[model samples]
Target chain A: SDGYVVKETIGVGSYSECKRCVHKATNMEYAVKVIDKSKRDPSEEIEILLRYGQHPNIITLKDVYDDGKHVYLVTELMRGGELLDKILRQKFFSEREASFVLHTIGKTVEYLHSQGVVHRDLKPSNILYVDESGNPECLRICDFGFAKQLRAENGLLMTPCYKRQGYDEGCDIWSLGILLYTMLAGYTPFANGPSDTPEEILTRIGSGKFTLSGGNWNTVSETAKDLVSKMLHVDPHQRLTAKQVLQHPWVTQKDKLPQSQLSHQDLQLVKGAMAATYSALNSSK
Target chain B: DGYVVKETIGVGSYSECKRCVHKATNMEYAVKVIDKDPSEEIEILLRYGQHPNIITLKDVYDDGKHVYLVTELMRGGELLDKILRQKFFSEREASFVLHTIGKTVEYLHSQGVVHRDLKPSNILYVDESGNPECLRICDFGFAKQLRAENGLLMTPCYTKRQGYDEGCDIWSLGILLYTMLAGYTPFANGPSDTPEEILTRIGSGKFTLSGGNWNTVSETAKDLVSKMLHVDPHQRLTAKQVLQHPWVTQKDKLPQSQLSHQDLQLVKGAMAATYSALNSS
Candidate 1:
């Protein structure tokens, strides 16, 4: 606290608050996540960040400080906001644009897997941009709270998701599938109805009940659909890994993707879905 | 067709580094002949190879069976070899060396690259003159690029049980500085010290600048080494921070007096033992 002059709160979570701070010595700006130690432990998070934070696309952990009551995680301040926010603001949401976004995320996921890390909660909200320039290269992965480091003895990760038992890095590929699907179609594949319960959504996800035959799906290329299918496969073993996702033509040949814009109706739905998802996440917390 | 292969300069597990001459221009260069395809080393070299303190990659040729990477020839031997031969090493000379390498490291970090294996051997002189200006960082076999959405850089864990980052380079530089000043490594007790003993001492992070040659060494120089060798990576001095330190920035003001004769003896003994071990291996 003495080294940094705290500014206004940029974000608020259940147990932590993100505040903009300026270093007392260099006057360099940084985003400090003040996690109250009484509510939660941030040691694991800190360790992970220090270990892997140097990656350009991953949020850089600049400094860490603890003063009994709170643990301050000082990281690079991102100005571009959430990935979903950027998508909603886009005037033309083309396959090319979506591919660029997916490719960046895919590379990040590939890196995580290589390091024996499984980012269990990879979603649009967790993805962020380094700046507000709208550059696709600026995308970064944040919020590693749900991440797990798989050991050599046990390569499986146990978490409550679409999978009940042991799941590995394939879990992140499934999330990527959801992200890609929503990016193109403007809504989640599992959410059939506005009134669908959490159980119903999970049931749909588990059964892999989704289609690419309607509306904006018609505009999406066959290769894009193929990738989504491979990623969303129910069997973790059958699903495309992060490395495979990066190598897939849909992501590798992003420059060749369709530049045609998605319908305004689909864009509106995407905006609505983003708001709903954000609110739901906040309320649940 | 464009170059002539000359004397063999170095060898690796699957590659051989040889001196070559450009056929048309008659320019001297070193070419790395690899048995297999390639690694990220080529890409990393191409990206950051343009720097003066970093070895320049002039050309590359792939003939399906072998990949030839032609880089600027470094006539001067390893930094350690040069230091071992020196009878008088002063604080000013050490500062000059650290500052030059520090600038290169700072530039690399700014570009999101980490030279994971930073050792005295990796650092070379441009010529036999062994001037500080001629120092170039080579051997990108262990170099890594840290980009947005990429994996963390990890070498077979040596110091830290839980992976390490750019701090590893800083730590290596500290050891290099220590060797320059004190002659032998900070962790080594004598010629017969085993690798296990050295590693244990390194992990303990217990070293002294209290006796012998350290008596004549400046406090600022000792302070810089202490900060770099900090066991805690987070608390360690960054490349940029190192450049900003008074010892480096005011290197001209450092003592130019020759180090002690005891320091010279230590250097000669350590070098002889190391050479003997290498020959036996």
Candidate 2:
């Protein structure tokens, strides 16, 4: 319902298509999710989504429909926001921005856990930014199709080899650790190694070596540094929870400045750099 | 696109209902999704999301703050609803609907997954009002959690149930067979009877010994039901496999019907609705 027009295919998945479409009434732009009916279980899928796919920080489903041949989904299109990849490429942010992002994402994870849902795939592509009347929202959690209702306390595979993993959140916390460290300091800690595999990086990450370095430490606050220690805590029980994230002084300072305003040039520069690096590394194939 | 909850054509995986719809295009279609997380959902969508025979996913727009899935709408069909209302299907007529349903199921299995919930209620007839009634099965979402142990491994794909009646949709085939022959549910006895019990006892079902139950029923039809209801999930008859069965293939004189008065009305309404959607104000 927001006033963005989607006009191109930004991303494509096996089951859904992310299209750039226009809002006829508002002449705005947004992204549309198109699904093939021959591949989905519409009935049960609807119920599952209605239950866990909600949160201020999470993406919301604005509309849903299915032709006999195709299923159509319409949702708000975030103008253009940079992922953590971009944020890192720019030598990370001030401790203020870092804490703000962490707290927002943390709050969302708290809601997800409380509702017995888990964002198994939490990455930069899935974490988005939205500008509301020039105020930049910290982050928007998208892609819920992978979430699962707690069948039992331990009935999930939290650590997907596709992404980084720590012990808790089944290594997802490891990803959070990576996110935290990257937020504080630019560059992927484990990715600096020769192996480009996710598992290879995660293996080194498990060694407890991922940390804030590269001299950005001078600009960041000590409180932000402490939160990073708790996030990267090896023991699951001792780890930081979303609620605990808000209690930090960094989060307390977030309300002072609305959001981390970023320009298209800023977002594009980071994205292009990251894409080039990824292509360079993987192109060895 | 068509309606979703309006006709209540869609149902839960565990619920009992047959899929049925008005014989016309009164704007009827639906493709729902389940499993919001990426792991199971991504796989399931991969297996089933984009197929020619399958339904289409509508557009879901996102503004970076929120997202929405705009699905095609289809009014609920009356398959199970009709039978629940005590409408009986004759033999030759049941074959026509069952054949259509079986073909669709066969196509689905061929793609590599099983439709775990295949009941008369789940087998939807999209156009019930047409002269030659047309059916399209709905509620494919049951495949979301196919094998409890495997946990959503079938990414956008369906596999043949290890074994069951008619390939994997055998149970549904049996349910369809029972719907045609018994008219009312054979094991239902009444509403209080659990659907699972009905499904369980369907395996041990027998054609009623007395009354018109046996009078007009053919041995081939009985044989077909027996094959479709092999209690063991692995040994069910498959749609393609069933096509060659004597009942379907050998019947050189399969009964053909002159359209019934209701069938004519159903067709007219469907045509009119299509016209309306195309050019109506």
Candidate 3:
């Protein structure tokens, strides 16, 4: 971080925005998350990532700097667009591609859980691709704001919860399940029910009664549907753990599988849905 | 008006590259913000953006405070970064990179666009991706739009500039390619060298590859560089022909020796002397 000059603000999160920085000494580039120390502390996020950040899939925190008012968390710059954005840009949508996405997320999440860390929020918004090049498919997990660390004192991770009804790694698994569904189907598995409220959505999520029979799913493979169903089960115990999800045929044979052979209009619908969802999320940002 | 200007990625005499996000689409772009008027630059960018090698001018925004010429954002930093960071680059690597730029210049010339300013800093990589397959020509501050109709390539009355055409860009590309291969430029001017001295040295068309720096380099590669650096525009090879050069065409057959360490230092020092003076805070 010596004499690293600020290049430009690459991202603006709720609490902090990442600024691309370059060091004069080595000309090495990095993204520094500039968080105001007065408003909040970044120690929690730093601790979570530092403990388990060394993995190739997950974003790394190289250094931390604390001046009087601002705290900077230096990280490898990840400039490629988000998972959903990349998905939309692709000319063809395929189960093989979707599995590769899940495989990456699952691999990273598995490493994260093994380190006793739970990325409570594992939505598309939190996942990012690294740099402008480097496989274009490779991803880096960041935004550990909602991340939590597990401890034996916290009920052996079974009942470990923090913020919002005391969640655990299961929440991440559930999020992954939902993400997989959205990735393939181009729509959330369980939207808000009845009056279209969060309360209603939770009931639907708990009930696990969402339909997988939409026209969009007609083109999706059964193995994919089966994996998504297991992950989205009502009870956390019934959910496919990251380990099992990774072993599933869907993830295991991601490369050997063929592309999604859907009709032209159906492909258009999925693309449209992907674009719609991207726009919706962006409006909120 | 719908763009959210995020951060400045570049700066020129009176312009800058501001990262812009489309308010509705949220697509990121590098918007070239030029003060005063941009009628010529905009016209040239719009005309040339059709090419894949050239950076696309996505959209335009005029807010009185600043006129934004939105284009593709190049995140790969500078060619100098890769040249400095990479211990040694092979002929294939250098040719591939230069070939990519040569095509862009070819495309520009085809569209009657002369990017008068084609320096290392003006050339950019699309991303940190090590592919280096894609190179973008940017900072068209000194770019001129020449007419193709008839045999006349008349100079603009407003800009009565002397002695430059597509040839100026060819010379710059020679400088860039020479730097990529030899580390230091043929200009051989340190900070102490005055602008007149720099101009005179360049005007003399005197540069050498006789040093140990060019020993490892192939003659075909040096031949291409020589033709590009030639003072006579008519005699110099066009960008199209540069692409056809054996060194550029058979990139795979070129030598792969690591460039000398001394050359790297010399180039670094030369860059520091120039860019540090221009961009140093």
Candidate 4:
């Protein structure tokens, strides 16, 4: 991890530039967050990284190597699976898989909270499947540059004078709830695109309006629906804390009663549920 | 008249607060807290009042000293203050009102780039008069995010920090949420003086996390602080996401806690209180 040999410029963010780099000593693979140490508050960033460096759910910052010119943060490599990107590619996710993903992430959030680190930027892209547990497709979370550490209680990021105060713990909770909503339902609870005005989004959110497609509908379980509803409420104070979420009936019930478990009589009742009954057989056949 | 504004509530004694009795039902009344000399208030109201949720200006006339405006008051029950008057909000009520506010804000945001100067003083709750009789965005004066003005994006409205952007409104909202739950403004650390000084704390956004004593002060309240305080103006949540804030979306809370139910009850009671006090006091 001593040299700055650029394998390829992977992505560029507002503050730092990220590249896929190889270490000169061992010639191994890693995602290097190459930051121009001279330009901005390097100590503050390094401190933030150092605080969150250990959480497994976070994008693992493998090692920090700097030669006074560019600071290189070696991170774990992400392979094929990006939660939502993969979902979009796969079109949709079944309730079982979605639940497992939510549960796993919830557990990770629990772990992160235990570590006193918050994943401020928690969208699907930050979650990747470098590893999976079962058919549920469990994976690990990555990307911690924006992560904030309120626990360490030292070295402050000369927080811009305008940032909202007292949000260190609550912000991450908001993000995970949002992530659960998105993963279970295959869309965001907020805006359609980036350019949409904040005011416009507020209006929609106020109305309790959301866009869910027919393909992504119906198959979702009731608990999942209820969880989405609760996790997506607009009032921050009304939201579920990570601990409360773990206790939620949807997440709490270790096992479930499948559709097949219902009585044949119950199934018979539902058979007549299709109100618009068009029972005619195809004459062409 | 398309809208019938009946009796004026004795509650109008407050400087800008006006609770008017309407004939909608035995329980409903609309409360209009006006910013009397808002340099350009009427135009903004007329532009926005046509919507179904916004209170319609039933009558407007001026008294020699102060202008009096009348609106068909909404009476659900309370302003989220009456039910728990002294106690803090419950999670359910918070989410409900925020959801309503978010949708309303979204609609307003869509109409144009609008920002509500939401404070605990503005949120209203009318009991199940149900339609959007609740969740009304009351005061709109410090509401500057209507559209980004390249020339004077910041205002001297309150003592504000130097570099403020469209995101200040969001900070105000988080503060509003904190106030709604904890029963006091987060920035109550300072006085509400001239527009510039007010804007100063708003823009600089530093405030004592008071109620630092109340065990009821929730983590969601703290999280609200974190997000609304996001310094990067662009990074601040959109009005929609703010409503979708973690606390707002929460399904449950600790035992013996009634913050959510309290929030709802307060709103409904306020509407009821306004309706009952319309003529009395």
**A-chain TM-score of every model:** 0.85, 0.70, 0.79, 0.72
Candidate 2 has an lDDT of: 0.51
* lDDT for position B235 in model 1: 76
- For DockQ, the strongest prediction is 1
Consecutive 10-residue window with the lowest summed lDDT within model 3 chain B: B152-161
How far does residue A199 in candidate 4 sit from its true spot (Å)?
4.5
Error of 3 at A207 (Å): 81
Give Cα distance to truth, residue B209, candidate 1, Å.
Answer: 50
Instruction: Kindly indicate the candidate among 1 and 2 with the higher DockQ.
Output: 1
Report interface Cα RMSD per prediction: 16.7, 14.5, 30.1, 18.6
Candidate 1 lDDT, B1-281, residue by residue in tens: 69999999998777899999999999999999999736688977875677778898899888888999999898997887675674256888888899899888876765456787786777999899878889999888867765333444532210032125678778878878888887677776556766566666767878988888788888998998999999777678878789999999887789998654334455545544433332344
Q: Which tens-of-lDDT digit does each residue in B1-281 have in candidate 2?
A: 23233333344333322222223444433433332322433344434444332333444334444322333342335465443333444555556666666665565554345666565444444444522234444445445343424232221122243444235466657655664555544445444454455444544544342355544567787777777755556666766667657776655444433211123233333323322232222
Using lDDT as the yardstick, the better of models 2 and 4 is 4
Q: Predictions ranked by lDDT, top down?
A: 1, 3, 4, 2
User: What is the DockQ for all candidates, taken in turn?
Assistant: 0.05, 0.02, 0.01, 0.01
Full-model lDDT, candidate 3: 0.69
Model 1: which residue pairs collide?
A: A56-B147, A56-B148, A57-B148, A57-B149
What order do you get sorting by TM-score, best first? 1, 3, 2, 4
Best-fitting candidate, scored by lDDT = 1
Model 2 Cα shift for residue A87 (angstroms):
4.5
